[PDB]
Amino acid sequence: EATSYALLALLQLKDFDFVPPVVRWLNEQRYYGGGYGSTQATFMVFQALAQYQKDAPDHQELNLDVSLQLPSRSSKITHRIHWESASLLRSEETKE
Amino acid sequence: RPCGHPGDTPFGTFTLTGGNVFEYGVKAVYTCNEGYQLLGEINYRECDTDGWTNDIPICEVVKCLPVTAPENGKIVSSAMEPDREYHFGQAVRFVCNSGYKIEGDEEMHCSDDGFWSKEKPKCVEISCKSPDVINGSPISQKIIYKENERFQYKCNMGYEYSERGDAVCTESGWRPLPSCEEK
Amino acid sequence: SITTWEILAVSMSDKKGICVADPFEVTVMQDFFIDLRLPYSVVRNEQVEIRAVLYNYRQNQELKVRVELLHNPAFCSLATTKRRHQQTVTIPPKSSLSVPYVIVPLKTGLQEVEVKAAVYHHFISDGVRKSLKVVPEGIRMNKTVAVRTLDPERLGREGVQKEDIPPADLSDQVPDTESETRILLQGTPVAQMTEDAVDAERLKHLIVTPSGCGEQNMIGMTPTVIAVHYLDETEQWEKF
Amino acid sequence: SPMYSIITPNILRLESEETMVLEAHDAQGDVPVTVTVHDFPGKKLVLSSEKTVLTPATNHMGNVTFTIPANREFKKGRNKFVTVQATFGTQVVEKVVLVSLQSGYLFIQTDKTIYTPGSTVLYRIFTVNHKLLPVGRTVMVNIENPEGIPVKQDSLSSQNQLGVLPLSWDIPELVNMGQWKIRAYYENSPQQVFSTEFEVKEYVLPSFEVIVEPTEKFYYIYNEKGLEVTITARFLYGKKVEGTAFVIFGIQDGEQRISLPESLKRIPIEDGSGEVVLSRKVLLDGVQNPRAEDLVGKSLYVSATVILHSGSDMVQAERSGIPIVTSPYQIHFTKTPKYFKPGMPFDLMVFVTNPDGSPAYRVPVAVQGEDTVQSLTQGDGVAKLSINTHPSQKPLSITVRTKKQELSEAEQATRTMQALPYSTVGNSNNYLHLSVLRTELRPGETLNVNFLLRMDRAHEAKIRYYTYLIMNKGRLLKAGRQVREPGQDLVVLPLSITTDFIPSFRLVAYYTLIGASGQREVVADSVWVDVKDSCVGSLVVKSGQSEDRQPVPGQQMTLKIEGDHGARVVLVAVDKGVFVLNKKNKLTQSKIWDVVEKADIGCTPGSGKDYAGVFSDAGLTFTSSSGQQTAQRAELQCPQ
Amino acid sequence: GKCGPPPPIDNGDITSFPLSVYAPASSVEYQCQNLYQLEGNKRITCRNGQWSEPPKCLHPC
Ligand SMILES: *[C@@H]1O[C@H](CO)[C@@H](O[C@@H]2O[C@H](CO)[C@@H](O[C@@H]3O[C@H](CO[C@@H]4O[C@H](CO)[C@@H](O)[C@H](O)[C@@H]4O)[C@@H](O)[C@H](O[C@@H]4O[C@H](CO)[C@@H](O)[C@H](O)[C@@H]4O)[C@@H]3O)[C@H](O)[C@H]2NC(C)=O)[C@H](O)[C@H]1NC(C)=O
Ligand SMILES: *[C@@H]1O[C@H](CO)[C@@H](O[C@@H]2O[C@H](CO)[C@@H](O)[C@H](O)[C@H]2NC(C)=O)[C@H](O)[C@H]1NC(C)=O
Numbered sequence A: 001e002a003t004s005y006a007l008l009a010l011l012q013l014k015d016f017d018f019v020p021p022v023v024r025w026l027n028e029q030r031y032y033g034g035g036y037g038s039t040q041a042t043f044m045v046f047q048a049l050a051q052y053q054k055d056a057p058d059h060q061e062l063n064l065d066v067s068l069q070l071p072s073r074s075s076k077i078t079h080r081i082h083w084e085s086a087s088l089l090r091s092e093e094t095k096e
Numbered sequence B: 001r002p003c004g005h006p007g008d009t010p011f012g013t014f015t016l017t018g019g020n021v022f023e024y025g026v027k028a029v030y031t032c033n034e035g036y037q038l039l040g041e042i043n044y045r046e047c048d049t050d051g052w053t054n055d056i057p058i059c060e061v062v063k064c065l066p067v068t069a070p071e072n073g074k075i076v077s078s079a080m081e082p083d084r085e086y087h088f089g090q091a092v093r094f095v096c097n098s099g100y101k102i103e104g105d106e107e108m109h110c111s112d113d114g115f116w117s118k119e120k121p122k123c124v125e126i127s128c129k130s131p132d133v134i135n136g137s138p139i140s141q142k143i144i145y146k147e148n149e150r151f152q153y154k155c156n157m158g159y160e161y162s163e164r165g166d167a168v169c170t171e172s173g174w175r176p177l178p179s180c181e182e183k
Numbered sequence C: 001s002i003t004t005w006e007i008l009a010v011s012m013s014d015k016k017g018i019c020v021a022d023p024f025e026v027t028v029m030q031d032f033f034i035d036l037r038l039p040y041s042v043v044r045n046e047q048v049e050i051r052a053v054l055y056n057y058r059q060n061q062e063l064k065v066r067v068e069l070l071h072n073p074a075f076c077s078l079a080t081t082k083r084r085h086q087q088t089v090t091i092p093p094k095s096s097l098s099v100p101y102v103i104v105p106l107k108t109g110l111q112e113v114e115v116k117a118a119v120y121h122h123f124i125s126d127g128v129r130k131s132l133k134v135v136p137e138g139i140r141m142n143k144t145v146a147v148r149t150l151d152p153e154r155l156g157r158e159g160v161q162k163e164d165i166p167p168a169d170l171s172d173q174v175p176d177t178e179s180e181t182r183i184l185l186q187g188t189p190v191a192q193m194t195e196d197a198v199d200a201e202r203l204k205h206l207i208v209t210p211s212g213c214g215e216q217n218m219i220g221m222t223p224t225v226i227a228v229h230y231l232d233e234t235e236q237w238e239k240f
Numbered sequence D: 001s002p003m004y005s006i007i008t009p010n011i012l013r014l015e016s017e018e019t020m021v022l023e024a025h026d027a028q029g030d031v032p033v034t035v036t037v038h039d040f041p042g043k044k045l046v047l048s049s050e051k052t053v054l055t056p057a058t059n060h061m062g063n064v065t066f067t068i069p070a071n072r073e074f075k076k077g078r079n080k081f082v083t084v085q086a087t088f089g090t091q092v093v094e095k096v097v098l099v100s101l102q103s104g105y106l107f108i109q110t111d112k113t114i115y116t117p118g119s120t121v122l123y124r125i126f127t128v129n130h131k132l133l134p135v136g137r138t139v140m141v142n143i144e145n146p147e148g149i150p151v152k153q154d155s156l157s158s159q160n161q162l163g164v165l166p167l168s169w170d171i172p173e174l175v176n177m178g179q180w181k182i183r184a185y186y187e188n189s190p191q192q193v194f195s196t197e198f199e200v201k202e203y204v205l206p207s208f209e210v211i212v213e214p215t216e217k218f219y220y221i222y223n224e225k226g227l228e229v230t231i232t233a234r235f236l237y238g239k240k241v242e243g244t245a246f247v248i249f250g251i252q253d254g255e256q257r258i259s260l261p262e263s264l265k266r267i268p269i270e271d272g273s274g275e276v277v278l279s280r281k282v283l284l285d286g287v288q289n290p291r292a293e294d295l296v297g298k299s300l301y302v303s304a305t306v307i308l309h310s311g312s313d314m315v316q317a318e319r320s321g322i323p324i325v326t327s328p329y330q331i332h333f334t335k336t337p338k339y340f341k342p343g344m345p346f347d348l349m350v351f352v353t354n355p356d357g358s359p360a361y362r363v364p365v366a367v368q369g370e371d372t373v374q375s376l377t378q379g380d381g382v383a384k385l386s387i388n389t390h391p392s393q394k395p396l397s398i399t400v401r402t403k404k405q406e407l408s409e410a411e412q413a414t415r416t417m418q419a420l421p422y423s424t425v426g427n428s429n430n431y432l433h434l435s436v437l438r439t440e441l442r443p444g445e446t447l448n449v450n451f452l453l454r455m456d457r458a459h460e461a462k463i464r465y466y467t468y469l470i471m472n473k474g475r476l477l478k479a480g481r482q483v484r485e486p487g488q489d490l491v492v493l494p495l496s497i498t499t500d501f502i503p504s505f506r507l508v509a510y511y512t513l514i515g516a517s518g519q520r521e522v523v524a525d526s527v528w529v530d531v532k533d534s535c536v537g538s539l540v541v542k543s544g545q546s547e548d549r550q551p552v553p554g555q556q557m558t559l560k561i562e563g564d565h566g567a568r569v570v571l572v573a574v575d576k577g578v579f580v581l582n583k584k585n586k587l588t589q590s591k592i593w594d595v596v597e598k599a600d601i602g603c604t605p606g607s608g609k610d611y612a613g614v615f616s617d618a619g620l621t622f623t624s625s626s627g628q629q630t631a632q633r634a635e636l637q638c639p640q
Numbered sequence E: 001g002k003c004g005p006p007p008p009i010d011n012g013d014i015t016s017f018p019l020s021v022y023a024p025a026s027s028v029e030y031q032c033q034n035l036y037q038l039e040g041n042k043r044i045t046c047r048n049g050q051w052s053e054p055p056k057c058l059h060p061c
């Protein structure tokens, strides 16, 4: 119960660098609630995990801007590397 | 004296005028495909005593002026290069930021007239009015609600709540519609 | 072209939907024609032989035919600007004849070969004008000039990362015969930060009917309420 | 006593019109019905909300047509479900239905099958829904190199294009050869990705075609004559070919090819035809195994190189996949229901094929022990065998053999199947059997549906009507009632077959009553009926001129195109030389109907183990207010 | 299933004032004009969203 309260506190302070160790230990206990006087320990552990899967953040932001900057004036190739098109092969040719 | 085949241009067909075989005195007028404009004034080819007339016409696809992301909004569609000529067919989508709801057309594509199919929408703050619950009366006294604000209501005599008994203000509107069922 | 064309049709109606018609074949032919068999490509300055095969498909009528190879400054043959390359052959009925021409491609790129023919005593002529690719003597090669890791937030200064790419070796490069360097950008995704959800089966026992008095009722209501709240968030009603 | 029941497809699709049939059996007066579809489990939005009234004039049977918008609310990823809530008066009947992400169909047509570096690929994407009707949506297109890396994305619109989307992609001069791919998917359904390939290669047209055609479509392992092969070479314009052919044979084992150098032959091609025989002795000597039985299961491939006497063109062609077999046929029970009704005639759809997989025409088949039950395969290689089942709970085991005369018993094909008894509600022995004469059905005819009832006579008068439903392309096409008089065991339903039944439809009919221990009982039965694959309308391209007039290079010609009024027709003319080089990924009508049938929600030829299995296996969810309902379906894909 | 407005008859009307929707088991009575004779049951009842049979008025001479 105490560790569940603390996890709910880390989910409010946005300290996502300390959350993975806590959650992993909670899963290792295999405590599934229920039983004689499980009320608090059942409510809090599942409330904290439900809040952990809610505040769950998707993927590390990918947004690369790669510009070929050549001293001679011509046409300029700009590139927006986004998450949705990360695998897109962006080829740029230069004859010299 | 026959001329040769006047050749095909990309994205364009031709019809013969004044005859039916590529012979002396025929005209081969060209017309581009749907979404492609007849670039230039050279639109025909006449089989003369030496050959066809000047040039072979060129078809080019019409393009749309790029659109920027609206105030408090983003453009989450199309592809690759930003602020490049969007040509006939390419579609685009708008998605407002968290806390802003779309007010207009959500999508649009590059039309034939070099313009966009629909107009550029706006991103307006999420706002929910006080719902008029049928066979019931509200509990809360607030009229204007921001996002995620809850709206408490009760059902009149002879009625009771259906599923959810309150309403939450989200971007698309109230998520739980205030409804009252028979007892 | 002297071949058979396959015309394919697909119709789309508002009330009838999609329909792919059966292929309609249309064969195109002539009584007399030239089949100019050109290779896909040839090496610059290398002597090659091409064949122009003249076909006469008349049942019982022989043809006295004259065949000519047009002069082209981009190729080398006996055909010059002053003299022509003619030969007067006789093609028997229902038969064919092969005329060999020896040429030497002089300049690279899409060059053109044109062979014409006309028969004596008849209003029957044909011409064939085809193109072939002339390719530099050397062999297509590519060198991996650079492979650099892009990471501005980690390897870059003030948020920008500048990579300097050295010029390619190009030591055995054929004079001129230009090169093309490809700069290939791709993204490196991550997506990992989520803890394994509690198995849905291990929660089957938390659905309990509440009973008892003011305090025991809540003891029975807690596991059921909290179970639905968890299964709703993790979306595990499929396995449950 | 009154029972409210709803039926909805096993899986519900987005942006597609779905029907729901509502019944209130043993009811009087008007019954107000309001159907609402909500998301699962939160019910944040009301996806649909329609109303109807069940009046005695309509026999208390109505339908609700609704189209669920592809809302931005649905999240690989977890599977999504919806809650279907039907309200009849006070009573409410709810069912949780699975949702498929497929928005409809996308078909890609490239002008050619193979392309040279530098040329432009012209392709059209046809955008339709599950009814194959043109729609206007946003489609994402990905160009993919043989390595697998996408090299060009795009997002276009199908609106105001009549369901046809003309696109092009330029091939660079410097490019990697091999099999390229186009990948398109609807914007709303990024999980349903349709693909087409095209080869990129440096080539020249061969100007003629070489055909390697074996005498038989297989090779009998004990045939001393060996594999005799006829070579047929002809120019692309029709005329025959004189030349010389180099023919060589090989044995293929899975993906390991072993050439037989001793079998190499040089034969004259005279009058466009030649013959070369692979002797059995050379075949056995070529392989390092004296036991010929081991060659069974392997295949043979033939490679022929024809050179013209002029020496100006050369064509290599190959014919592989010639199975070395011990039987000319192969029996499959993939079209015969695996459940029977004890005491009622059991129908079997035997599927006899040639070793190469093609249907086999006029093949005698019979059941072991029942020489009387001997049928003949039709044009599609499907035969019908009706047997008489005894009233029993014993597993019905059937063994079908081919009885092709003039063929020895060692070469006759054999296959064994088993069917299980249709378990009834409370062992009441109440069965329903729908039978249909198995024959190629065509649009514009009428099929007599025979409703045959078997049950005790103690409750036979209560059954006054049957409820029949039709499933086509994965959606409810038609529902209705069939009046039945007390005493009649068999009634005939004149079902009018129109173009909306292509390519096939399932007919699942059921009746309900209150019998035995005053329990509400439902008995169902379903049958799968195939229809002659064809277009919904028609489209023919023929000569629009005199066939004395011969086509000449450059000559104008008239093309007669006859099709449906208002239809937009897209054309393409391809040189047959292309197909001599590559004839794969060609858009045909048979392939379109193939895709449609693979997205079907039904998983069985017919019937089921119980009354719920009939609905579930036929792609339907039944849910009554009394509690009789089908089990949930959580699998987008059918069970293996 | 509630009922709707009661059906009108010839040479007669309802004794009360009509409502838009009637709860189940509701009932309204009928009445003919003067010198007309009512035949049948003067009361109709809302059953299964449908009123029962309305009476008829007999024409005098
Ligand atoms: C869901 O439930 C509805 C209930 O209406 C069903 O709709 C029935 O579907 C029939 C398809 O077989 C249709 O019958 C057709 O009606 C044609 C007339 O067109 C109507 O035009 C009006 C415009 O005022 C529209 O509202 C209607 O929807 C129709 O489009 C007829 O020419 C034709 O035939 C008729 O029916 C019988 C056939 O034997 C004749 O005897 C009769 O005299 C009449 O000519 C054609 O069959 C029609 O839409 C409708 N019919 C009836 C009787 O309700 C849906 O099919 C149901 N959907 C599912 C999936 O079950
Ligand atoms: C250059 O591109 C080619 C594309 O085909 C790469 O592929 C190999 O190509 C060579 C011939 O150029 C052959 O050995 C094989 O077809 C391929 N080899 C392998 C191991 O895949 C080639 O690797 C590229 N070279 C460089 C230096 O990037």
Ligand SMILES: [Ca+2]
Pocket: D503, D504, D530, D531, D532, D533
């Ligand atoms: Ca079929």
